[PDB]
Each structure stands twice: as structure tokens, then as C-alpha cells.
Amino acid sequence: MRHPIPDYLASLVTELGAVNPGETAQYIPVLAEADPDRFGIALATPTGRLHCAGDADVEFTIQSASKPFTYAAALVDRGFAAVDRQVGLNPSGEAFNELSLEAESHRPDNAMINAGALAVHQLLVGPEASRKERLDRAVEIMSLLAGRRLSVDWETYESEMAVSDRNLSLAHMLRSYGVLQDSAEEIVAGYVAQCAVLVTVKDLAVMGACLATGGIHPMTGERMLPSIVARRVVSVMTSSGMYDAAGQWLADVGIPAKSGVAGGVLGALPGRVGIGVFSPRLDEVGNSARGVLACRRLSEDFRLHLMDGDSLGGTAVRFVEREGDRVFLHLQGVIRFGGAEAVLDALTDLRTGWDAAVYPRWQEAAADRAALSAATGGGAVHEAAAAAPIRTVVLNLARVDRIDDVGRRLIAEGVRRLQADGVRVEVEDPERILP
Amino acid sequence: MRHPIPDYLASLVTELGAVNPGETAQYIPVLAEADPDRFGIALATPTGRLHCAGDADVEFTIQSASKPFTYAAALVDRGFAAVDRQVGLNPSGEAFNELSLEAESHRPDNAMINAGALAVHQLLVGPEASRKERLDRAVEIMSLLAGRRLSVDWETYESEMAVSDRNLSLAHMLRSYGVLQDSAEEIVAGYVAQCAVLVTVKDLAVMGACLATGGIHPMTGERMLPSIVARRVVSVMTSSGMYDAAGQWLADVGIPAKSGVAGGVLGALPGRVGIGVFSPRLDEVGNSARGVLACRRLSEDFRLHLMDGDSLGGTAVRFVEREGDRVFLHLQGVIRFGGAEAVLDALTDLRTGWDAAVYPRWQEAAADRAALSAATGGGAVHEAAAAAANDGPIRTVVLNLARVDRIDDVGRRLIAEGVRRLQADGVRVEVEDPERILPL
């Protein structure tokens, strides 16, 4: 049997590919003359899959879709305080207003606009890094998240460098307020080469997936970025990535994204998917017309949204069974606050230690313990109450994939209170992830 | 034993409660004279738990934290097209600029600001509804989500109605552009009454949870709002709920929220928690000082954020075992796109039907299937590959959904297709669906 996702994409490409509105970026001949009859799409999942269709293997310069990655690199190389001193978090469009530097926050609005992107490149490796070290760094971060060594399209680079007065203007203004210590030319050149890095629809998807998983590469399971960094990046993409798109992106689509004038759209939906779309022609706001439309279709057809409550929750509890005096509590999944909270509810429900009159309905619902949990997604937490003198509780973490420090602290505290009740607790933790 | 979360909250209240900066809302004596020495907090989970501490049961007027709820009622009552024609989605602060209405659409920026909130109240029941019906509707929607009949604090209402020139100004301007049809006085009165609705920290937490779960009441499991409506509300809260707060709320805290000048803060983090906080004194932008500070601490201490990847994912596959010619594939959890994608991967991985030389690291990782899974998330999806891994074709696949809590139409459509294809391979599929959640 073939996977149905790739078929949906193939169908989507055929449907939306029936037309080709807008026009390629006209600012440089290499892009203006680019073949418009191309349309590809790729989805990278945490399950390590890559569902594609169309020209998802055709290279094109990433352009502004590079901004979220050099931003992550800067945060990693310098720390939040250093980066935040130069780049703000204020949602904004590209139009430059000197008041953002002279007043307000006294720094370029955010990393998604050119002024912020320029300050990010200036920040890359370190305070006194050379231009080559910084470009290498920009190329490296993107290559590491893509899973392969990427190259810069020097032809595109040279063409753009001939028509960069606006970017040079921004860089000079930044210098005058101290945001850039190096020359306008040096930083613009780095930013332009950064934008000229060649990637495929598939590359973007995987790179986006790395952000969507909270910093974990979906193909290797290796942590590429601190979750705190990946979260900041996707947060900024949400607020400003599609600032000038029709309607209101977060509300309408709910998929953090960023387009590039060469036709590539990057998407990163936390906990679910990395997205890459390629279609040369741009709409009037400057985003890939079909790339944008494809994202709106993915969001609608698959009911994907930053706001949908798809969490582990009570499923963190695989089951709770009792054998006379001892109870077996097996956990599973990616446990964080939500999962750990559910685990504590189960422990507390063992009885090893609102007003019902006010909410009669809440009591009746709570009566059918299993039904309420099903309509709520409480996993097997309700089994704990069913199990409930208990003298021993075996805590099995074999099925738990991973857990963050918050989850560890909460469960650890849960274990302490169980013992404080006079209950023996043995933790079966084969890959010892609890400590 | 005692649940540790309530203890955490109790400690948080004790700590943050060591100081009481700012001042109560000075615009009306009822709020200006309110006992400032009060601080409560409550968390309502999807499981159906309510962890609280401090003065979490002291009533106060919900004020602006009423906005997301009336907005939901309007969407439910009139539909998206009708509401969107009068209420925008443009993020904005409370400062009013006439230019916002001079656009082609002629509508205030969003439902979180007063102007948009007045437009929302005007849409509440229908085109010809009366003032009384609209107020009843506002009180009702909040009551339905809170789980109990709420009442309006008329003393606060009368007090504020005596100093409503600014809102009357907004109302008049909105009528001027056709956003409001009834009198400025009638719409302002309804909005003020709406803000005078009495709730406790606990009420807010539960109300917020209804939004966080996508419209399902955490205590009864009953759907109170279409998920699509809940999503729109939380999106709008995210973009403008804390617009003028220090820093940038979404990035720093990541918890969709809204404060009220009476001291109450409403929080709603999708899939994880409904938050209600109460602390009378306000900071300089007009938000509850400790209420906001408590939300920042909840986000940091529990590492909660709208951007975390806390999804079922591969865990949707409880396990995949094999007995000769048949495979037992058991699913579980709340299944939507994410889980269904994983289920399809498991089905495909049974083998009933990138370049390795380019990504040698990807191959090596794909070798230790179990390790790659734990590190990523795939739950037991990998057991399918192990099941396919030397003697005999798979003839039957038992698809058990007993552990599945629920599934949306997308997961329902994806799994049905995967099953049809398995069958097309000549594999027998018997779906064990006791509560039959797969059909439709």
C-alpha cells in the first residue's frame, strides 16, 4: 500500500498547479528569468518521514527563509541577552521607520525584517569574528538542520550585490545607532550570500521540522538546537513571518511560516510538521502565490493549526493494573508538564493517603469515569481510581520516549509523596531517564 | 498523598504575595476602594482537575476577560462571515485611531479592544435581538463555560455607567461607520454589564480550559463550542490579549491571556491548561501586576509555551505485535492529523505491498529504529517495521481502537483510506471499535 499523504500532495500540486498567477521576482535577472513552470512541496514529520510531490527536489535560493536559521545560530553562539540587545521582538513589516531605533525599543523590530536580519548576521559567530567565519556559520546552521552541506549560488549573489542600496541603507543606519560594528558592505555581503544559499523544497521541510520538534532532527534524533532557542524562533516567525499576507495568518492558517522571493515557503508547526513549498511566481505582497495557497490548503484540509489542542495529556499513562497489594503504573510518550500532571493525578487517585452540590452535572460526569476521560483524552488516568491496601507501586518508564526536567521534578515529587504515605515504590527505568 | 501542583501554587502565592505593587483601578470607587490584599490562582486541566491556592474563590468583575467569551458567542450565533465583516483580526492596542475604520472593511481592529468588543456585543444574538436578549446571551455564554449561572454586579455597573464617556465615544464613532446599528448608549450599557459579570479565579480557569481543549468542558466532556470557534478566539487572544505588556508576550510567556482592571487574568494554553488569576492592583499599563507576574512564572517554572511540541504523534500507536500471519495494531490517545500520520506510517511499514548515500547519518539512525523513535517520539510506530522484519506474508491486521479517546474527521478520513489500501493488498482488516468512533 502506498502512503496516502504523498498522494494528497500530488493531487494538491495538480489542482493548484492548474494556474500560475503573479510574477517572479524582478529585482535581479537570474530570478526574473527563472522558469515559472515549477511547483513542489514537502512535509517532514517527527516520525522521520518525508512526504513529497512535484518539483520538491529542485534547488532555489532560500532568501529570507534563511532568517529563522541564522537567528537560531546567533542565539546559540551569543546567548539571548547579547542577541536581544540588538534584535527586538516587535512584530512589523519591512517598511523602515527610524523611530524604532531612535525611540521605542531602540533596536530593529525583529529578526524577520531585513534590518533585524542584518543585525543577526553581524552577531553570528562572535564579537570579533571575521566575515568568512560568519558566512561559514550561516551556511553551517542551515546545512546542519538540512542534514547535508549546502552551497551558495554565487551568480545570484553577484546579481543582488549590484542592486543592494536599500540593504546598504539599513546597514548604515544600524551602524549609526551602534547595532552594527562592522561596515555596511561587509554585513550586507554576508546577508546577501546567506540569502543565496541553495535549498530544495525537501531541505526546507526538514529544516522546518528541526524547529517544529523543539530542536531535534527528525531523521537522526540528534538535538540540533536548545528547545528554548527553537521556541523563540518559531514565536518570531509566527508574529512577523507573514505580517503582510492577506487576512491574518495566525488566525487564518495557524502555521508559522516565512517566504523567500525565489519562491520557497518555510513552515514549522510545533509537534507536528516541517513544511517546504516551491513556486517561483510571487503575489503582490512578495510571497510565493502558490506556496502561500498551498499552506492555507494544508491548514484547512488536514485541520492543522498552532491552536489545536493535540497534546499527550492523560495518554502519558499507558495503564494502571493491580495485583492484590501492589499496583503497576506504566507511563509512555514525550512527557512534559501536561503528561507529568496527568501522572500525578493517577498517583493521587490511588487514595494511599469544587462543591458537588454546586455542580451536580460535574458529579454525574465524574461518575462515568471512563466516558469522561474518553471525551477528554485522559488516557488511562481513570484506571488509577479503578485500582483504588496498596503496599507497593511499580513505576515503569520503558515506554516513555523522553521527558523534560519539569516532568522529572514533578514525577520525582510524586514518588516522594507516595513513599511519604508508606508505600514502597520501585522505578523500572531501563534507559534511566528519570534522574 | 496530596497533589504537588496545588502546593506549588500555594508557594507561588506566598512568594509573589510578599509585595503588592501598583494600584487598583482608580476610575471607579467600587474598584478603587477594593481590598488590595487579595491574591488567588487556579489551574483547570483537560483531565478535569482544578488545582488552586490563595483567594481563588473570591468573586470579582471579569471586565475585559469577558471579551473572548462574547466573541465566541457572536461567532456561534452569527457565523464567521457576519462577525468578520464587523470585527477585524488586526492586532492592536487600546489607543483608538479613526483610520482603522476608514479602511475598505469599516471595522475596529479586533475583539480584544473596546471598540471591537462593542461591535461584538452588538452582534450577539441576531440582527433584530433586543438589548435584554443580548445581555442574557453574554451572561449565558460565560455561565455555560463556567459551569454555573453567573450574576452581574450592578453596583459596579452603575458606578462605571457614570463614567463611560470614552466607550460612548467609541460607540458613536462605530455607528458613524455603520459598525453599530443601535444607539451608543444601548451598546455601551450591554458591554458594561458584560464586564460587571462576577467570577472567581476558579471560574476563569475552567472557562479558559474550555477554550484550551478546543471547546470541550473539562468537567463534563461536553462540547460547548465548535473547535474552529475556540481556535479563532485563542488566536485573537494571542495576538492582542497582552499587546501593551512589557516585552513581547507570545515570545516571552507563550500563554494566550487577557487581564481585567478588577484584577483578574484569564489564560488558555491549547491542549494543556485553563488559567485564572486574581490580584486587584494593576501595573502601569492597566493589567493585574501579580496576575501577570504569576503567568510569567507559570510559563517559566513549568516550561509551558504555545510553541512546544507536546503532541501525541507516534504514541498514537500503542503497539504492533505479530502472531504468524496476523498483526495486532492497537491505537490510543486523541487522534488528529499528527496521530493519523503516525498510524499510516505504521500501516505502510508493514510492507504488505532521500538518498542513503547522501545521508549516511540518516541511514545509521534508521538502523537503530527503537533508539531513533524514543529520541524523536514515534511511540510504537517502529514496531511495525519490526513486525515486517523472513518468513510468511501478513494475512490479517487487527486494528484495535479501544484505547483511542477520540478522533477528528481528518484522522478518520486518513485511517479509513489506509485501511482500504491495506485491503487492496489483499490483507484482511478487522476493526475492533467498541465505541465505534471510526465511522463518519
- CATH value at residue A222: 3.40.710.10
As a three-state string, the secondary structure of A140-197 is HHHHHHHCCCCCECHHHHHHHHCCCHHHHHHHHHHHHCCCCCCCHHHHHHHHHHHHCE
Are residues A338 and A215 part of one domain? Answer: no
Name the residue in chain B with its Cα closest to that of A371. Answer: B221
Are residues B59 and B195 part of one domain? Answer: yes
- Choose among A27, A25, A47, A44: nearest CA to A36: A25
Name the residue in chain A with its Cα closest to that of B353. Answer: A1
- Side-by-side strand order, sheet with A392-403: A317-323, A326-335, A392-403, A424-428
The number of C-alpha atoms within 13 Å of A228 and in the hemisphere containing its C-beta is 10
3-state SS assignment for residue B406: strand
Are residues A124 and A147 part of one domain? Answer: yes
CATH of the domain at A319: 3.30.750.24
What angle in degrees, to the nearest 10, is found between the helix axes of B184-195 and B131-146?
20
Grid coordinates representing B348 are 505502510
C-alpha–C-alpha distance, residues A381 and A311, integer Å: 15
Exposure class string for B273-293: b at 16+ Cβ within 10 A, else e: bbbbbbbbbbbeebbbbbbbb
The minimal CB distance from B338 to the residues A310, A332, A338 is found for: A310
Are residues B259 and B139 part of one domain? Answer: yes
The number of C-alpha atoms within 13 Å of B226 and in the hemisphere containing its C-beta is 12
B149 interface with A at CB cutoff 8 Å: no
The number of C-alpha atoms within 13 Å of B413 and in the hemisphere containing its C-beta is 10
With a CB-CB cutoff of 8 Å, which residues 275-304 of chain A face chain B? 301-304
CB-based contact B212:B46 (threshold 8 Å)? yes
With a CB-CB cutoff of 8 Å, which residues 129-148 of chain B face chain A? 147-148
The radius of gyration computed from the CA coordinates of chain B, to the nearest angstrom, equals 26
Q: Where do breaks (C to N over 2.5 Å) occur in chain B, by preceding residue number? A: 353, 389
* The length of chain A, given as a count of residues: 435
For the question of residue B261 being annotated catalytic, the response is yes
Are residues A199 and A75 part of one domain? Answer: yes
Helix (H), strand (E) at residue B431: strand B428-432
Are residues B369 and B237 part of one domain? Answer: no
In terms of C-beta distances under 8 Å and separation of at least 24 residues, what long-range contacts does B174-182 make, across chains too? B174/B101, B174/B108, B174/B115, B174/B118, B174/B119, B177/B101, B177/B102, B177/B106, B178/B106, B179/B86, B179/B101, B179/B106, B179/B107, B179/B108, B179/B119, B179/B122, B180/B118, B180/B119, B180/B122, B181/B122, B182/B122, B182/B131
3-state SS assignment for residue B330: strand
Task: Render B108-137 in DSSP notation, one character per residue.
Answer: -S-TTSHHHHHHHHHHSS-TT--HHHHHHH
C-alpha–C-alpha distance, residues B313 and A311, integer Å: 9
3-state SS assignment for residue B73: helix
3-state SS assignment for residue B267: strand
Are residues A147 and A74 part of one domain? Answer: yes
Are residues B317 and B305 part of one domain? Answer: no
CB-based contact B215:B223 (threshold 8 Å)? yes
Residue B295 annotated in ligand binding: no
Q: Give the burial class of A376: count Cβ atoms within 10 A of its Cβ; 0-12 exposed, 13-18 middle, 19 or more buried.
A: buried
The minimal CB distance from A313 to the residues B214, B271, B410 is found for: B271
Give the residue carrying C-alpha cell 512589557.
Answer: B246
The number of C-alpha atoms within 13 Å of B138 and in the hemisphere containing its C-beta is 35
Last residue of a domain, one of A309, A328, A343: A309
Are residues A127 and A71 part of one domain? Answer: yes
C-alpha–C-alpha distance, residues A376 and B46, integer Å: 6
3-state SS assignment for residue B349: helix
Are residues A376 and A265 part of one domain? Answer: no
- Choose among B71, B283, B70, B94: nearest CA to B197: B70
Residue B210 annotated in ligand binding: no
C-alpha–C-alpha distance, residues A332 and B311, integer Å: 13
Label the pairing between strands B50-54 and A392-403. unpaired
3-state SS assignment for residue B273: strand
Grid coordinates representing B413 are 478520513
Find the farthest-apart pair of alpha carbons in chain A and give their distance in angstroms, rounded: 80
The minimal CB distance from B379 to the residues A236, A372, A401 is found for: A401
Residues of chain A found within 8 Å of residue B315, distances taken between Cβ atoms: 312, 315, 332-334, 401
Task: Render B285-310 in DSSP notation, one character per residue.
Answer: TSSBHHHHHHHHHHHHHTT--TT---
Question: Cβ atoms within 10 A of the Cβ of B432, count?
Answer: 11
Residue span of the structural domain in which B298 resides: 1-309
C-alpha–C-alpha distance, residues A195 and A52, integer Å: 24
The minimal CB distance from B216 to the residues A376, A380, A406 is found for: A376
Q: Is there a contact between B342 and A47 if contact means CB atoms under 8 Å apart?
A: yes
Are residues A203 and A102 part of one domain? Answer: yes
What total of structural domains would you count in chain B?
2
Grid coordinates representing A14 are 495538480
C-alpha–C-alpha distance, residues B407 and B437, integer Å: 7
What angle in degrees, to the nearest 10, is found between the helix axes of A201-212 and A131-146?
90
C-alpha–C-alpha distance, residues B304 and B295, integer Å: 10
B234 interface with A at CB cutoff 8 Å: yes
Resolution of this entry, Å: 2.2
The helix/strand count (H/E) of chain B reads as 18, 11
C-alpha–C-alpha distance, residues A283 and A285, integer Å: 6
- Choose among B248, B242, B308, B247: nearest CA to B273: B308
Q: CA angle, corner B293, sides to B290 and B298, nearest 5?
A: 120
C-alpha–C-alpha distance, residues A58 and A264, integer Å: 11
- Choose among B208, B222, B215: nearest CA to B257: B208
A239 interface with B at CB cutoff 8 Å: yes
For the question of residue B71 being annotated catalytic, the response is no
Residue A27 annotated in ligand binding: no
C-alpha–C-alpha distance, residues A383 and A318, integer Å: 10
The radius of gyration computed from the CA coordinates of chain A, to the nearest angstrom, equals 25
CB-based contact A120:A85 (threshold 8 Å)? no
CB-based contact A156:A196 (threshold 8 Å)? yes
* Experimental technique behind these coordinates: X-ray
For B313-419, strand residue ranges (E) read 317-323, 326-335, 396-407
Residues of chain B found within 8 Å of residue A250, distances taken between Cβ atoms: 235, 238-239
Query: Which amino acid is present at A382?
Result: H
Residue A195 annotated in ligand binding: yes
* The length of chain B, given as a count of residues: 440
Grid coordinates representing B216 are 470541550
Q: Is there a contact between A366 and B312 if contact means CB atoms under 8 Å apart?
A: no
C-alpha–C-alpha distance, residues B130 and B147, integer Å: 25
Exposure class string for A92-110: b at 16+ Cβ within 10 A, else e: bebebeeebbeeebebbbb
Mind telling me how many Å the CA of A160 is from chain B's nearest CA?
31
Mind telling me how many Å the CA of A383 is from chain B's nearest CA?
12
C-alpha–C-alpha distance, residues B416 and B421, integer Å: 9
Last residue of a domain, one of B262, B281, B309: B309
C-alpha–C-alpha distance, residues A401 and B391, integer Å: 30
Are residues A329 and A239 part of one domain? Answer: no
Name the residue in chain B with its Cα closest to that of A237. Answer: B251
Last residue of a domain, one of B267, B282, B309: B309
Question: Cβ atoms within 10 A of the Cβ of A391, count?
Answer: 12
